Amino acid sequence: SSSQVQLVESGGGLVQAGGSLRLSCAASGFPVYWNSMYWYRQAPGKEREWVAAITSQGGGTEYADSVKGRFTISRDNAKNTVYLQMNSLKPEDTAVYYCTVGVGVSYRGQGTQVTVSAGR
């Protein structure tokens, strides 16, 4: 049942530039270890932007150039959750972040709002 597949993102919020955030994508209805998964972001008006991917099994991880060295994607196979560690946050990182899974049949979460402000 495709219905049983669920992705729920949390961790978003307000944070100052240079700060850090940990996003969680909690998955149910399927095992995260066996399914490549992706983080996307979407700012209003601008087009959707792929952020990172974690391949099933040991296939590794990949990152968009804008985030290389700043973000880390990881996976907890037991808890069936995928994380996005966000460090050295800039204002251009403001967007809705959501996770997705699936080839041919794609599923996605609603997203979690991340706002990065500049400070003194």
């Binding site: 729920v8 149910s28 209805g29 808890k79 069936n80």
Partner: peptide
């Protein structure tokens, strides 16, 4: 609250929201 054992159709548990 991290996932918990949720009863599936097959009478077994799978990760789900708590």
């Amino acid at each position: 609250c991290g996932p918990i054992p949720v009863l599936d159709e097959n009478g077994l548990f799978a990760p789900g929201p708590c």
